[PDB]
Amino acid sequence: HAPHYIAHRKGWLSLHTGNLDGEDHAAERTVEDVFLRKFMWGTFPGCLADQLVLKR
């Protein structure tokens, strides 16, 4: 599925309150997600079947 299905057919891999109206620290959560994904893809090489789901 293509990017224009993110709220129609797909969902969001990461789920956090940062991007809600009135909340803060969206950038810090984004950088955290970036590091988690690279770290996990480097620590489980060839094991991950799909993308991670990061819940908070």
Partner: protein, 291 residues
């Protein structure tokens, strides 16, 4: 492909999962229904996806897998239907029945079925010419003195979609504390929203936000717009109006008041006058708005 043992196993899996969901939700498993299943799955697995199909679903296996594979002969190989070898046993059986009824009669806001719906009911693909032939036979049956059974048989093929009447639902008549009859109605034009109360009897006094109309509307165009509904039905000076308009600008407010007053006035005119107002554009919400 889906084998019959495969779907059998999905049937026991669905039944056991249904009993489990009844356990989880505290409902009685015996009476636990499919609407209950849908509600419980919506609660337990919330999903805001716009596509209803993409949302999590727990259906009976028969509702998921199509399996339109009907057996037309038994173990001995003999077909069940005597018209099997035509290849269109259902369609030709129906034509045979219709011809029999035509022979019997000869001895003595709705629509014809569409082709693909006729296919759905006959569960067999059929061409356009044979569909026309069937419809022609049905018309011939209608032309003859069809009895109750034949009328019901044709009604099996008759859909009720055709025709729709634009009648302009009238507002009810309310009565105020003083005993006067009035009717209330609403209108909208651009961002202006208006609500008008039209009294049955009056002297032609219009009050906009508690202000006289000629003071509230300095521009003559707005006053002509407010005059239009009452003049069109020749009852100027016979009703009192108390309206409230908010938002928009001068012309949008005038138009919204015009619409609200026309819709409220529809209570005190004859249905012919209501239809004349509709045909004059006085009862239609103008949908033109900025990009």
């Amino acid at each position: 492909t889906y084998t019959e043992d495969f779907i059998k196993k999905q049937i026991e899996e669905f039944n056991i999962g249904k009993r489990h969901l009844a356990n989880m939700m505290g409902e009685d498993p015996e009476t636990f229904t499919q609407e209950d299943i849908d509600r419980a799955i919506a609660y337990l697995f919330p999903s805001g996806l716009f596509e209803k199909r993409a949302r999590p679903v727990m259906k009976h296996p028969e509702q998921i897998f199509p399996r339109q594979r009907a057996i037309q002969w038994g173990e001995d190989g003999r077909p069940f239907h005597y018209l099997f070898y035509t290849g269109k046993q259902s369609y030709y059986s129906l034509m045979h029945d219709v011809y029999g009824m035509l022979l019997n009669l000869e001895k003595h806001g709705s629509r014809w079925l569409i082709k693909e719906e006729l296919e759905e009911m006959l569960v067999e693909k059929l061409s356009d010419l044979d569909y026309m032939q069937f419809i022609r036979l049905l018309e011939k049956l209608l032309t003859s003195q069809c009895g109750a059974a034949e009328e019901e048989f044709v009604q099996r093929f008759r859909r009720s979609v055709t025709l729709e009447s634009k009648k302009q639902l009238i507002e009810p008549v309310q009565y105020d504390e003083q005993g006067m009859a009035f009717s209330k109605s609403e209108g909208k034009r651009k961002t202006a929203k208006a609500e008008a109360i039209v009294y049955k009897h009056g002297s032609g006094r219009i009050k906009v936000n508690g202000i006289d109309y000629q003071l509230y509307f300095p521009i003559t165009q707005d006053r002509e717009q407010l005059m239009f509904p009452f003049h069109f039905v020749d009852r100027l000076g016979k009703h009192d109006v108390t309206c409230t308009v908010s938002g928009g600008g001068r012309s949008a407010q005038a138009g919204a008041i015009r619409l609200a007053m026309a819709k409220a006035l529809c209570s005190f005119v004859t249905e012919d006058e209501v239809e004349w107002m509709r045909q004059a554009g006085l009862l239609t919400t103008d949908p033109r708005v900025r990009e």
